[PDB]
Amino acid sequence: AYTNSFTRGVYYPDKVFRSSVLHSTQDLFLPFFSNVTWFHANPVLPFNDGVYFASTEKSNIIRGWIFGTTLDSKTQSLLIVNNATNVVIKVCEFQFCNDPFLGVMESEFRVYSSANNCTFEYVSKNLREFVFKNIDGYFKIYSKHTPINLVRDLPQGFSALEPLVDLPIGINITRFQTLLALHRSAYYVGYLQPRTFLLKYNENGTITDAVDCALDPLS
Amino acid sequence: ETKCTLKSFTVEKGIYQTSNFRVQPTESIVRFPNITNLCPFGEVFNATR
Amino acid sequence: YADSFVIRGDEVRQIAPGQTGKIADYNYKLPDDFTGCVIAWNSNNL
Amino acid sequence: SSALGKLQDVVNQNAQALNTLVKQLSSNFGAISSVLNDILSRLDPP
Amino acid sequence: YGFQPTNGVGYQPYRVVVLSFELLHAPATVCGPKKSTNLVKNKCVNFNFNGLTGTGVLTESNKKFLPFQQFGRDIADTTDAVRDPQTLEILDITPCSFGGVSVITPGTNTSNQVAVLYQDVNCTEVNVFQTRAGCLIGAEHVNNSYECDIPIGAGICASYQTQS
Numbered sequence: 001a002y003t004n005s006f007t008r009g010v011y012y013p014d015k016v017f018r019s020s021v022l023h024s025t026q027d028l029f030l031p032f033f034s035n036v037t038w039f040h041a042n043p044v045l046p047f048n049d050g051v052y053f054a055s056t057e058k059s060n061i062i063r064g065w066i067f068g069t070t071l072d073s074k075t076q077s078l079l080i081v082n083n084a085t086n087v088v089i090k091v092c093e094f095q096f097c098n099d100p101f102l103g104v105m106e107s108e109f110r111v112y113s114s115a116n117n118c119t120f121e122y123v124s125k126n127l128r129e130f131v132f133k134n135i136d137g138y139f140k141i142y143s144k145h146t147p148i149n150l151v152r153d154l155p156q157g158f159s160a161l162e163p164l165v166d167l168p169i170g171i172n173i174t175r176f177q178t179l180l181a182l183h184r185s186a187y188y189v190g191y192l193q194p195r196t197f198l199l200k201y202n203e204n205g206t207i208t209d210a211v212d213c214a215l216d217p218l219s
Numbered sequence: 220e221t222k223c224t225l226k227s228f229t230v231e232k233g234i235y236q237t238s239n240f241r242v243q244p245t246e247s248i249v250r251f252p253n254i255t256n257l258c259p260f261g262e263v264f265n266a267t268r
Numbered sequence: 269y270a271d272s273f274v275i276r277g278d279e280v281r282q283i284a285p286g287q288t289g290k291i292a293d294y295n296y297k298l299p300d301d302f303t304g305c306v307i308a309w310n311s312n313n314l
Numbered sequence: 315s316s317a318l319g320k321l322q323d324v325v326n327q328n329a330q331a332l333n334t335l336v337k338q339l340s341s342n343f344g345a346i347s348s349v350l351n352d353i354l355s356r357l358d359p360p
Numbered sequence: 361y362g363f364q365p366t367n368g369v370g371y372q373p374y375r376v377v378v379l380s381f382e383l384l385h386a387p388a389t390v391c392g393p394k395k396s397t398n399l400v401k402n403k404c405v406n407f408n409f410n411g412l413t414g415t416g417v418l419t420e421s422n423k424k425f426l427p428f429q430q431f432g433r434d435i436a437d438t439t440d441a442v443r444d445p446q447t448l449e450i451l452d453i454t455p456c457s458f459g460g461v462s463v464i465t466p467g468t469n470t471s472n473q474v475a476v477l478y479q480d481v482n483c484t485e486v487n488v489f490q491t492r493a494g495c496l497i498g499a500e501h502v503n504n505s506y507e508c509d510i511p512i513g514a515g516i517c518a519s520y521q522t523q524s
């Protein structure tokens with residue numbers, strides 16, 4: 001299936017506060033009214049320039065992503081996981097199952113079978129959006145958690161995404177995947193292009209509205 | 220100063236812009252994130268075995 | 269003004285208008301507003 | 315109480331010009347940055 | 361090695377640590393510390409917050425950033441606020457007073473007395489009389505109204521009477 005975003009995938013493109021103004025930016029955005037894939041419950045996707053990624057549930061079936069160029073050994077990759085404990089970022093050379101996942105006893109993690117040469121570690125319904133990008137050896141992640149009053153369909157509205165993480169890795173990326181918690185006892189993928197937007201800033205400094213300046217003559 | 224900026228030993232009545240003025244910085248300050256991970260080389264240079 | 273001396277064969281490009289180097293930063297400097305000639309010729313036979 | 319466009323236009327023109335003057339303090343014109351404290355920090359005087 | 365405490369030097373055990381700095385091709389990594397200083401308010405200073413470099417006078421403010429926002433800027437894109445990275449407090453930035461200086465002369469063919477106007481400057485930062493055109497030094501403020509002689513501005517004029 002395919003679906004239509006309406007006004008989705010807007011993130012704060014810098015750390016700068018702004019009071020009641022209209023500011024114009026050039027960056028990598030998800031164009032308004034786009035053609036976003038639909039997935040149910042998954043396969044190896046491309047990256048090619050950033051990614052928008054939403055998801056919907058009350059349980060937690062979406063348990064992180066895996067990135068990289070080959071998703072195996074012989075080249076390095078990232079791995080972002082969340083068991084019922086908390087997030088586990090990790091950067092080694094792995095050996096990934098071609099269909100990697102984790103179970104739910106509640107024993108799991110048939111994800112990889114190798115953790116060699118680790119160069120970075122870290123340990124510690126609902127709509128959960130994420131924007132992933134990778135520039136100059138930094139892997140930036142923006143995110144937002146809005147509550148839907150549906151269960152698993154893409155809604156309409158405006159909600160800007162706030163920066164979360166910054167990782168000075170150096171890693172090359174060309175592909176990525178997803179991770180799901182099996183049954184033993186809905187998600188979308190947009191892509192980002194270089195656009196020019198007009199963001200409206202509140203008096204507290206939040207982005208409340210935007211204009212995509214390449215949609216139509218009025219814009 | 221008027222005679223210099225007017226290039227003349229006589230000046231006529233009026234008001235004349237002669238120079239600018241500005242306050243100079245008293246000192247310098249520097250701010251930066253706090254200190255947390257300063258590397259504990261007291262594990263490799265301070266091992267028991 | 270004739271300034272006459274002897275250097276190592278490498279830092280002959282260190283006698284130039286405007287530069288950084290261990291010979292130029294410590295033992296001899298020329299202004300960036302230099303005007304004149306620089307002559308160098310080899311010497312281990314003297 | 316419910317037309318002064320000729321007075322509004324001369325105000326607008328002057329403000330639009332003064333803003334364009336300040337917005338030019340952030341162009342390179344073919345330099346490495348727009349800040350003098352950045353050319354005086356990663357370049358030698360020559 | 362059979363090490364024994366009664367061994368001549370050069371046969372006693374030495375511990376060795378070899379540090380090897382490498383530079384692959386990442387974006388950055390570990391570096392050395394960097395001394396700093398405290399903070400002062402209400403004085404023209406040269407500040408530096410994390411790389412934000414400028415000069416001016418810092419006061420405390422009534423803004424509220426967003427937890428991830430590190431400094432503010434206004435229309436025309438000048439920095440007019442900042443967050444300092446240790447208190448987590450935001451501070452207003454105001455340029456350090458400046459202006460023009462004008463001298464009021466009654467004509468050198470009449471006198472050598474002068475008055476001085478410091479344009480749009482408060483009088484504290486330089487008998488002494490505060491106009492809306494700036495701070496005026498060397499002229500007496502009388503209460504009568506004459507025709508204008510030398511225009512000061514915002515309704516004020518000056519003149520050489522009687523002698524002053």
Ligand SMILES: *[C@@H]1O[C@H](CO)[C@@H](O[C@@H]2O[C@H](CO)[C@@H](O)[C@H](O)[C@H]2NC(C)=O)[C@H](O)[C@H]1NC(C)=O
Nearest residue numbers: 257258259260261262263264265266267375377
């Ligand atoms: C290993 O740990 C010891 C103890 O904490 C450090 O020894 C200190 O060295 C300083 C400077 O020589 C002395 O003033 C202190 O008196 C020492 N400690 C004690 C408890 O007396 C030593 O510096 C550490 N090694 C390294 C490489 O950091």
Ligand SMILES: *[C@@H]1O[C@H](CO)[C@@H](O[C@@H]2O[C@H](CO)[C@@H](O)[C@H](O)[C@H]2NC(C)=O)[C@H](O)[C@H]1NC(C)=O
Nearest residue numbers: 251252253254255256443444445446447448449
């Ligand atoms: C930075 O470190 C200092 C201490 O080195 C922290 O200062 C404390 O701040 C709290 C307020 O939250 C005060 O109640 C304490 O009295 C302060 N102690 C000292 C010794 O100054 C400061 O909070 C730290 N800030 C950050 C952002 O880490």
Ligand SMILES: *[C@@H]1O[C@H](CO)[C@@H](O)[C@H](O)[C@H]1NC(C)=O
Nearest residue numbers: 002003004033034035036037
């Ligand atoms: C998205 O692109 C596919 C490509 O064939 C097309 O079939 C589909 O109709 C498009 N969806 C929308 C909403 O335009």
Ligand SMILES: *[C@@H]1O[C@H](CO)[C@@H](O)[C@H](O)[C@H]1NC(C)=O
Nearest residue numbers: 081082083084085086088123
């Ligand atoms: C969650 O997964 C990480 C991945 O290595 C692991 O380190 C951690 O121990 C797991 N949680 C528990 C409770 O074992």
Ligand SMILES: *[C@@H]1O[C@H](CO)[C@@H](O)[C@H](O)[C@H]1NC(C)=O
Nearest residue numbers: 073074092093115116117118
């Ligand atoms: C990465 O792992 C392989 C196999 O374990 C090893 O041959 C190689 O030396 C490792 N890389 C580095 C930089 O040591």
Ligand SMILES: *[C@@H]1O[C@H](CO)[C@@H](O)[C@H](O)[C@H]1NC(C)=O
Nearest residue numbers: 069137170171172173385386
């Ligand atoms: C990423 O892959 C490209 C392939 O064209 C390669 O040239 C580049 O060096 C790689 N990145 C790094 C940091 O080596």
Ligand SMILES: *[C@@H]1O[C@H](CO)[C@@H](O)[C@H](O)[C@H]1NC(C)=O
Nearest residue numbers: 201202203204205206208424
């Ligand atoms: C945030 O904005 C709202 C409306 O714009 C305003 O009423 C409020 O005072 C602001 N500050 C808050 C909520 O701290």
Ligand SMILES: *[C@@H]1O[C@H](CO)[C@@H](O)[C@H](O)[C@H]1NC(C)=O
Nearest residue numbers: 229231232467468469470471
């Ligand atoms: C200027 O001075 C000369 C010489 O004393 C005099 O003749 C002339 O009247 C003066 N001009 C005036 C008073 O306007």
Ligand SMILES: *[C@@H]1O[C@H](CO)[C@@H](O)[C@H](O)[C@H]1NC(C)=O
Nearest residue numbers: 481482483484485490491492
């Ligand atoms: C000048 O400074 C004084 C001293 O704080 C202040 O009270 C006053 O409002 C300022 N402005 C004028 C026009 O006096």
Ligand SMILES: *[C@@H]1O[C@H](CO)[C@@H](O)[C@H](O)[C@H]1NC(C)=O
Nearest residue numbers: 487489500501502503504505
């Ligand atoms: C000018 O007149 C006012 C009347 O309100 C008075 O308060 C003030 O002291 C007078 N100043 C002088 C210098 O006479």
